[PDB]
Amino acid sequence: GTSLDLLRSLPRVSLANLKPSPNSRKRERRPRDRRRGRKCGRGHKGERQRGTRPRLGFEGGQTPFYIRIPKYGFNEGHSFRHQYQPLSLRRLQYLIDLGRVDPTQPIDLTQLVNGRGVTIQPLKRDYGVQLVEEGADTFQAKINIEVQLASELAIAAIEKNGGVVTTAFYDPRSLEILCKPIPFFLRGQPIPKRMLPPESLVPYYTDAKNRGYLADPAKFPEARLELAMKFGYVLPDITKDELFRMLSARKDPRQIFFGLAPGWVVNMADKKILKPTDENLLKYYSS
């Protein structure tokens, strides 16, 4: 270009000609001149000038401000609280629009992370992704999304457009493998079973209205219809829809990945899957 044309005329670029970007660096002030020498910015003789003033929060000897306020349990149990990285429907639709999520295939935490739709940190107590009601109106997509937590209104958007929404619990060990599958296969260890939710979460994931994976299949129809009446839409017939098998697809409660059973081993180098023939191990894994 025109700017590129100027470079042609100018002398050859070399190691001598190198220059830092304007104002990128600062002058480092040293103590050798009158303004910055002598007392060297430390004032007169005293404790702060000897370099030995007290610690932070020390207010001269009176009871400090931070120690004189009652202890309260704002942050108690913080390290064991459950975190769900929320997902809104604007982000979901936006991701589907740009081809970073495949709506035709079933959706799960692995395919959200693969398309960089969501960022998950298992080490920071993340237990999955919670769907959020923001963006329901703009949502006009039919997709089978699995998310650990769901909401009433978020369910309506998925169902109204003719989609399947399910909620499943992944324990801390299961979640790490789900977000990051490949390395687990590199470790060489067999795939583990997925533990059931602890007592606190048992009511939620067994509840029909929450679309829990362990919930009774028979009660789903009624729960969907009641929600359909509430939000003023007519239930679509998924069975008639051509992709009924895909939408209806649901992984086993003890499965981390749809198509892989617990106890198998994946050999990427040889492009093979190894399954144990031992009866004892099969008993344990089948459980």
Binding site: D97, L98, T138
Partner: protein
């Protein structure tokens, strides 16, 4: 980053619209980000200096400044204060005009 899939009807429900075809004939071209979005960002410094910056500008940046100055002057009632970073190829505008500029750039087809 997958190339966005072709859609029958634009804009998509989210709001995304691909670059217009044929390309604009203006001297300056504003390229899209690797995520296929218009490179217009709200920025802030010191906690109260609100600015909006166009980043992937190409060609004669000066023409873009003149066009933006005319576009934003009637709304504010004054010529906006702007900086042109020729080396970085960016245009900086005081205040937040992300929504207005995004649509304005969309019409031109950049």
């Amino acid at each position: 980053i997958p190339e966005p899939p072709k859609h029958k009807h634009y804009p998509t429900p989210s709001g995304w619209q691909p670059p217009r075809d044929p390309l604009p004939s203006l001297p300056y071209f504003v390229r899209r980000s690797r995520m296929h979005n218009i490179p217009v960002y709200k920025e802030i410094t010191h906690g109260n200096r609100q600015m909006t910056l166009i980043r992937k500008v190409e060609g004669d940046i000066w023409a873009l400044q003149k066009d933006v100055e005319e576009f934003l002057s009637p709304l504010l009632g004054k010529t906006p204060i702007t900086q042109v970073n020729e080396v970085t190829g960016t245009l900086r505008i005081k205040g937040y005009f992300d929504e207005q500029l995004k649509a304005w750039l969309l019409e031109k087809g950049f």
